[PDB]
Design a binder for this molecule. Sequence first.
Ligand code: HEM
Ligand SMILES: C[C@]12CC[C@H]3[C@@H](CCC4=CC(=O)CC[C@@]43C)[C@@H]1CC[C@@H]2C(=O)CO
Lengths: 193, 463
Amino acid sequence: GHKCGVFLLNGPEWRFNRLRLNPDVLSPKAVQRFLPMVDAVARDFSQALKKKVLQNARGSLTLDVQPSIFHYTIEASNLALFGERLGLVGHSPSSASLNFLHALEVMFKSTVQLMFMPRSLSRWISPKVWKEHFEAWDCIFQYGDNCIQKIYQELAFNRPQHYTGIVAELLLKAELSLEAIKANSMELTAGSV
Amino acid sequence: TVLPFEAMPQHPGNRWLRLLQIWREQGYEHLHLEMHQTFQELGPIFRYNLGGPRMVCVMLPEDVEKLQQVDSLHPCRMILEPWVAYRQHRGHKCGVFLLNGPEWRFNRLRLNPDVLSPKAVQRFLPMVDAVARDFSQALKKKVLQNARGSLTLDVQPSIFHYTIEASNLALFGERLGLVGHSPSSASLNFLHALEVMFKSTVQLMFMPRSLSRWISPKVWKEHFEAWDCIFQYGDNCIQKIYQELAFNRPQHYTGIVAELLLKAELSLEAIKANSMELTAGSVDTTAFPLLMTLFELARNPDVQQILRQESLAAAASISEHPQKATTELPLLRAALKETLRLYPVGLFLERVVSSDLVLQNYHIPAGTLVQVFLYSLGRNAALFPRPERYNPQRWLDIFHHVPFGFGMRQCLGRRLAEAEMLLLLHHVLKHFLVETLTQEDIKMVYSFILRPGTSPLLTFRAI
Ligand code: HEM
Ligand SMILES: C[C@]12CC[C@H]3[C@@H](CCC4=CC(=O)CC[C@@]43C)[C@@H]1CC[C@@H]2C(=O)CO
């Protein structure tokens, strides 16, 4: 019983959402405002990595960077989107953090499984996969909703005089209903990693 | 007219349908609401068909006062069979909470000076304060990393870890490193075992061992394994301090248990059993009232601002002398009084009376089980004008406050608990605004301790 974000909407519900999202998510004006926040996380990634590199006698580190890049993007997007700093860059992955990366990967896999066949057929051919897919989404929504309940309750009490992120702008303006904001916020959270 | 015992109203409950409903639901989560409505139905006293022995439930300061006048020299509570059973199974002695008689008194009197007495607070309160300052520093650093200078979280885990840490420093002189850091596994195992110990206690305390041993044997192994874990945790603390003192007896205060071991008035075995009571009893009993207060303060920001006012005024002197926080923050102490009136961790006081007495002008014979239900007591509109209101002034204007019990059996950890709560609040109040959207009543649940069924999302905004 959730609303669909701009990705899954067609027609005029889509256009209503989109025109109320371009200004704070996509415009050059919004980029001027979040780019410095993103820069901070990027700076931090490079410093954390350098500390490790300089501890080594050959002055290099040789690693699979994928994990730490994924945690960079989770951190960067969460700061840009919600104005919170998760503490994931330069430290170890949290367990919410890893569960979220896993849930996304399972959600993508199962997507392909279910994608190329009608619900009428996939229902009985691959019911265990519908279960997997929905479980992945429950975990994703769990993570995204934790984020939004935090920002919502923070913004009901004080309207900051300064920029504290993309979703903050949407909530301050309150041009979209709460449910619409929640739906679009989920797409940006899930889609930003 | 001193009316005879029988005149007293009777609970419509069948001893047997209660056992069966506990067996079935695996608990009695509504105990407090039931007793409350019964009091609304049948007045401020009633009796329970226990099948022979005499149970009476009261809820008036009047009645508690009389009750203190019939504490023998050896005030007596009813054997909690499941707890004692575990002790005797592993060959341990019983600490003060599970003793009656001569042996209770011998232990208690060798415990008051170092755990409860004013001279003990003065020594351990600075250590507690050190942990409370750390709690807020750790929180401020997290908060200031956020663009809006605030963090919104379920605070239950970090508040429980504060009580573990503060209690441990006070009790053993050790810093466990659980404030401003993650839970250890030993930490989570301990909290889990406490939770399960409590849950199973309810199951086994409401039917004789007679039946429970074969009706719910899985509940027994569950209870014992929880205690095994709790003892493992508490024994490790004891092994450490014991070894350290055997090689060096310090010249400065290093906590409550040290004082006990140094004096060696009690046997090691008796010291071991009382440390386990303090270690086990110092976590949830304190954590939950602390959470309820944060919640009430967040629903009542006007009251919060008044409490902040005075904590800022005293900020100065308290950081110079932490020991003065007891005296200098009397409005914050009133708030605790107010939290425990509405949300008493110990739901009911309990005495098996050694003499006959009179309550509400009914005759109460000796050997009678008398229970004071503090939940209903705290909500009496008569003694507490506007009972539903969270108003610490209520206390400044004035046996109305007995959530720690009374007499010589009253809570041994009272001053510790109150230090831990008072100091955390004080330091939080100087630095943060506390806020929630979730303004609706939190439903309490009874599993031996009476605790919030839900944990609301609290925002801490830096000032
Ligand atoms: C807000 C927190 C607490 C509350 C509301 C509370 C409440 C109580 C109550 C109602 C009793 C029964 C008193 C009576 O029968 O008259 C009691 C006894 C006791 N409490 Fe607490 N308590 C708290 C915290 C603690 C802590 C932290 C400790 C350990 C440090 C502790 C240790 C004990 C012990 C050992 C007894 C048994 C004393 C005896 O039977 O002589 N309590 N407490
Ligand atoms: C407060 C309490 C008595 C004291 C205990 C507490 C639960 C935790 C606990 C564990 C111990 O090993 C020592 C006593 C104690 C601190 C009980 C919960 C309900 C009970 C009462 O309601 C007393 O009337």
